[PDB]
Structures are given as C-alpha cells and as structure tokens.
Write an enzyme that holds these catalytic residues in place. Structure first.
Site, short mmCIF file in Angstrom:
data_model
loop_
_atom_site.label_atom_id
_atom_site.label_comp_id
_atom_site.label_asym_id
_atom_site.label_seq_id
_atom_site.Cartn_x
_atom_site.Cartn_y
_atom_site.Cartn_z
N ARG A 10 0.98 -1.25 0.02
CA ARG A 10 0.03 -0.15 0.06
C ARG A 10 0.96 1.45 -0.01
O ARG A 10 0.59 2.14 -0.75
CB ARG A 10 -0.93 -0.01 1.14
CG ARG A 10 -1.82 1.51 1.41
CD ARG A 10 -2.98 1.11 2.39
NE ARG A 10 -2.17 1.11 3.78
CZ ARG A 10 -1.67 2.19 4.58
NH1 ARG A 10 -1.75 3.37 4.18
NH2 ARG A 10 -1.25 1.75 5.58
N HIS A 12 4.21 1.57 -0.90
CA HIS A 12 5.30 1.42 -1.66
C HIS A 12 5.25 0.91 -3.32
O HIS A 12 6.23 1.05 -3.79
CB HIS A 12 6.56 0.73 -1.12
CG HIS A 12 6.92 1.25 0.53
ND1 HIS A 12 7.14 2.58 0.30
CD2 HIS A 12 6.81 0.93 1.42
CE1 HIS A 12 7.59 2.86 1.90
NE2 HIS A 12 7.24 1.75 2.49
N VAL A 43 8.39 11.62 3.97
CA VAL A 43 8.92 11.24 2.79
C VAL A 43 8.62 9.86 2.58
O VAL A 43 8.16 9.00 3.45
CB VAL A 43 10.59 11.14 2.90
CG1 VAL A 43 11.30 12.06 3.23
CG2 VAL A 43 11.00 9.92 4.10
N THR A 45 8.73 6.59 -0.80
CA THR A 45 9.18 6.13 -2.29
C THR A 45 8.23 5.24 -2.69
O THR A 45 7.66 4.00 -1.91
CB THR A 45 10.71 5.44 -2.13
OG1 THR A 45 11.51 6.54 -1.58
CG2 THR A 45 11.03 5.18 -3.62
N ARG A 85 8.78 13.94 -1.59
CA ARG A 85 9.25 14.70 -0.47
C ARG A 85 8.42 16.02 -0.07
O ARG A 85 7.99 16.76 -0.95
CB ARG A 85 10.60 15.22 -0.72
CG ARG A 85 11.16 15.65 0.30
CD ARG A 85 12.42 14.53 0.59
NE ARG A 85 13.32 14.59 -0.63
CZ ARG A 85 14.15 13.77 -0.89
NH1 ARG A 85 14.17 12.61 0.03
NH2 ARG A 85 14.88 13.79 -2.01
N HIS A 119 9.34 -2.95 5.10
CA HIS A 119 9.70 -1.87 5.20
C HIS A 119 10.54 -1.36 4.02
O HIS A 119 11.78 -2.17 3.77
CB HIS A 119 10.57 -1.61 6.84
CG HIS A 119 11.44 -0.80 6.74
ND1 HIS A 119 11.18 0.74 6.98
CD2 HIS A 119 12.87 -0.44 6.93
CE1 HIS A 119 12.09 1.53 7.21
NE2 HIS A 119 13.14 0.88 7.05
N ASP A 121 13.82 0.85 3.23
CA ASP A 121 14.92 1.52 3.86
C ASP A 121 15.55 2.44 3.45
O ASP A 121 15.91 3.76 3.88
CB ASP A 121 16.01 0.59 4.46
CG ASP A 121 16.66 0.90 5.71
OD1 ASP A 121 16.02 1.02 6.94
OD2 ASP A 121 17.92 0.83 5.64
#
Length: 124
Positions: A10, A12, A43, A45, A85, A119, A121
């Site tokens: 969801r 990324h 932030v 990605t 960002r 996650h 990183d």
C-alpha cells in the site's frame, strides 16, 4: 488489522505505471494510498516494478539497515522509483510533495514466512 506485508504494498508499490508522469504524481498517490490521513508522512518512495520482482529482493544482497538491523537486503538491479518529499507549502491536511523520478537500487527489510518486504529503508 492490516499486515506489515500489505502495508508495504500500500505504501510503496505502483506496478501500474512505469514512472511518475507529472509533477502531481506524489500529491495524488500520497493521498489515495492513505499516507496523509493522520499527518503528512514526510518522505515516501514508490516502486514501479512487479510485486514479484520486489519480493525477490528478500533473497538478494543481505545488508545492514540504516538503523543497524541485519534483516535488510539490497536489489542486485536498479529499479524505477519515485521519491516523494514534502514541500515548504505542505500543511496538514493539505500535504504537498515534490515528485522526483529515479532509477536506483532499493534496500528493504524482510520478515515472516513467506519472507517478504515489510519496510522500505533506502534507495542507493
């Protein structure tokens, strides 16, 4: 309750596009993926690859996470990603983001069985 694996998809995964197509991509994606519900996530990605290719990273290069943990992995290949960002004009609930396209290696933390990403990183 949402699993860690589902939360990673969801927040990324965007297999539906090859790259961000306009400057509003982050603004739209952050809102629709519910990443601005309680506050503006600063932030985030998005990865523009198949889920299978991203899940495969958990069997690639094992590396230390930024925080020291050792369940992190880096992709052998670069991937198409969009870096989102928060901008100076961002003000909850109207979170605003700058959209940046890039092709980089990703590093994710993996857990569970099946062993999948939970996650994001960093991108290098």
């Amino acid at each position: 309750k949402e699993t860690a694996a589902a939360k990673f998809e969801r927040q990324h995964m965007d297999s539906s596009t090859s790259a961000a197509s306009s400057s509003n991509y982050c603004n739209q994606m952050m809102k629709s993926r519910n990443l601005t519900k309680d506050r503006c996530k600063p932030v985030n990605t998005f990865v523009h690859e198949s889920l299978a290719d991203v899940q495969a990273v958990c069997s690639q290069k094992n590396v230390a996470c930024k925080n020291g943990q050792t369940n992190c992995y880096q992709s052998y290949s670069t991937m198409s990603i969009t870096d989102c960002r928060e901008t100076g004009s961002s003000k909850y609930p109207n979170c605003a983001y700058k959209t940046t396209q890039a092709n980089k290696h990703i590093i994710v933390a993996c857990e569970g069985n099946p062993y999948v990403p939970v996650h994001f990183d960093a991108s290098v």
